[PDB]
Write a protein that holds these residues in place. Sequence first.
Motif, mmCIF file in Angstrom:
data_model
loop_
_atom_site.group_PDB
_atom_site.id
_atom_site.type_symbol
_atom_site.label_atom_id
_atom_site.label_comp_id
_atom_site.label_asym_id
_atom_site.label_seq_id
_atom_site.Cartn_x
_atom_site.Cartn_y
_atom_site.Cartn_z
ATOM 1 N N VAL A 8 0.575 -1.020 -0.056
ATOM 2 C CA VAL A 8 -0.082 -0.028 -0.038
ATOM 3 C C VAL A 8 0.797 1.275 0.014
ATOM 4 N N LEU A 11 2.561 1.994 -3.537
ATOM 5 C CA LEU A 11 1.582 2.861 -4.381
ATOM 6 C C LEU A 11 1.676 4.152 -4.175
ATOM 7 N N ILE A 12 1.584 4.467 -2.911
ATOM 8 C CA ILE A 12 1.517 5.901 -2.638
ATOM 9 C C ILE A 12 2.773 6.624 -2.845
ATOM 10 N N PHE A 71 -5.114 11.106 -7.710
ATOM 11 C CA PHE A 71 -4.828 9.910 -7.001
ATOM 12 C C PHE A 71 -5.754 8.726 -7.106
ATOM 13 N N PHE A 74 -5.536 7.161 -10.109
ATOM 14 C CA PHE A 74 -4.247 6.215 -10.027
ATOM 15 C C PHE A 74 -4.754 5.038 -9.536
ATOM 16 N N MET A 75 -5.559 5.127 -8.480
ATOM 17 C CA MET A 75 -5.863 3.766 -7.731
ATOM 18 C C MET A 75 -6.808 2.921 -8.868
ATOM 19 N N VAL A 78 -4.210 1.273 -11.095
ATOM 20 C CA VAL A 78 -3.408 -0.012 -10.275
ATOM 21 C C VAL A 78 -4.434 -1.287 -10.182
ATOM 22 N N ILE A 81 -4.431 -2.767 -13.474
ATOM 23 C CA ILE A 81 -3.107 -3.549 -13.860
ATOM 24 C C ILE A 81 -3.140 -4.842 -13.192
ATOM 25 N N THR A 82 -3.438 -4.690 -11.834
ATOM 26 C CA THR A 82 -3.509 -6.049 -10.996
ATOM 27 C C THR A 82 -4.402 -6.724 -11.163
ATOM 28 N N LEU B 4 6.508 -0.950 -7.830
ATOM 29 C CA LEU B 4 5.215 -0.907 -7.979
ATOM 30 C C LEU B 4 4.784 -2.373 -8.574
ATOM 31 N N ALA B 7 4.529 -4.447 -5.833
ATOM 32 C CA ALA B 7 3.521 -4.345 -4.748
ATOM 33 C C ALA B 7 2.247 -4.989 -5.553
ATOM 34 N N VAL B 8 2.307 -4.802 -6.809
ATOM 35 C CA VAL B 8 0.873 -5.250 -7.909
ATOM 36 C C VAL B 8 0.918 -7.086 -7.225
ATOM 37 N N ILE B 12 -2.049 -9.360 -5.163
ATOM 38 C CA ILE B 12 -2.446 -10.747 -5.597
ATOM 39 C C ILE B 12 -2.326 -11.906 -4.488
ATOM 40 N N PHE B 44 -2.936 -0.679 10.136
ATOM 41 C CA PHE B 44 -3.907 0.084 9.411
ATOM 42 C C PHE B 44 -5.234 0.114 9.913
ATOM 43 N N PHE B 71 -12.267 -10.855 -5.977
ATOM 44 C CA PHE B 71 -11.078 -10.174 -6.287
ATOM 45 C C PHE B 71 -11.276 -8.796 -6.585
ATOM 46 N N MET B 75 -10.136 -5.524 -4.852
ATOM 47 C CA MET B 75 -9.183 -4.451 -5.322
ATOM 48 C C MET B 75 -9.937 -2.864 -4.878
ATOM 49 N N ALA B 79 -8.267 -0.116 -2.742
ATOM 50 C CA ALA B 79 -8.114 1.394 -2.872
ATOM 51 C C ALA B 79 -8.628 2.313 -1.858
ATOM 52 N N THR B 82 -5.757 2.454 0.794
ATOM 53 C CA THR B 82 -4.592 3.150 0.129
ATOM 54 C C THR B 82 -5.008 4.714 0.492
#
Lengths: 91, 91
Positions: A8, A11-12, A71, A74-75, A78, A81-82, B4, B7-8, B12, B44, B71, B75, B79, B82
Amino acid sequence: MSELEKAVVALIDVFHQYSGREGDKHKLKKSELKELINNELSHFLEEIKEQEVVDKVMETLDSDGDGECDFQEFMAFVAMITTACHEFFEH
Amino acid sequence: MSELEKAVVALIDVFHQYSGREGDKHKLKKSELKELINNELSHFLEEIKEQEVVDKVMETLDSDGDGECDFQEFMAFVAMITTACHEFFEH
Ligand SMILES: N=C(N)c1ccc(OCCCCCOc2ccc(C(=N)N)cc2)cc1
Ligand SMILES: N=C(N)c1ccc(OCCCCCOc2ccc(C(=N)N)cc2)cc1
Ligand SMILES: N=C(N)c1ccc(OCCCCCOc2ccc(C(=N)N)cc2)cc1
Ligand SMILES: N=C(N)c1ccc(OCCCCCOc2ccc(C(=N)N)cc2)cc1
Ligand SMILES: [Ca+2]
Ligand SMILES: [Ca+2]
Ligand SMILES: [Ca+2]
Ligand SMILES: [Ca+2]
Ligand SMILES: [Zn+2]
Ligand SMILES: [Zn+2]
């Protein structure tokens, strides 16, 4: 911190790494987004060489029409992509 | 791989770590989600001890009403976390 917690924060950190370079320090303009993709997504995404191609990616990502990726946007990038990575490796 | 990119893959891996334990191996049921939060988001998020509290988190996350977090839903959870972390540390 757990792996998830460090992920996390990563990503930031990547967002701030590129967003702070030019103009609005909290948004990725097209130039910053191109740099992020080329330097940080070189295994996941094809290198961008043409203005047309970053135009198109920004069009996809830019939900409020300001020509930049904030941001929240951008999330969403992400998440895309994930999701695509997760699915690439499974049946 | 970049930070990055790692992180991705970590997102997963944590999802699969908890989703595969019970029932549908590709969704987090409430029991799996509670374990994920308590073991992986301990810095967190407040520890969950009550069924009421995981009920509420699952209600927030569960967009298709199947009582589980898939999933895509996970995600969205990532988000949210984050975004909340990013904002906690800034003005
Ligand atoms: N040789 C590899 N690619 C690879 C290497 C290590 C690895 O460690 C755990 C990560 C999750 C393992 C299973 O799910 C995925 C899904 C997507 C990617 C990816 N986006 N690359 C990688 C793994 C995973 C894949
Ligand atoms: N030992 C090494 N040098 C090495 C080991 C594994 C490796 O693996 C490359 C990438 C594997 C995972 C990333 O590749 C994709 C491709 C397309 C998508 C997509 N569908 N967008 C998502 C991920 C590369 C080098
Ligand atoms: N002492 C810390 N907390 C801390 C330590 C290292 C760090 O390295 C780069 C991460 C980004 C730095 C600035 O933005 C944030 C936003 C949220 C968190 C967080 N969710 N914890 C951490 C940092 C950041 C924070
Ligand atoms: N050296 C050490 N032992 C150490 C160093 C820093 C540290 O920092 C703790 C957590 C910092 C960042 C995580 O804390 C939150 C809290 C609430 C939210 C929220 N708004 N949801 C998001 C993040 C802990 C231990
Ligand atoms: Ca900027
Ligand atoms: Ca925008
Ligand atoms: Ca499951
Ligand atoms: Ca669901
Ligand atoms: Zn999977
Ligand atoms: Zn920021």
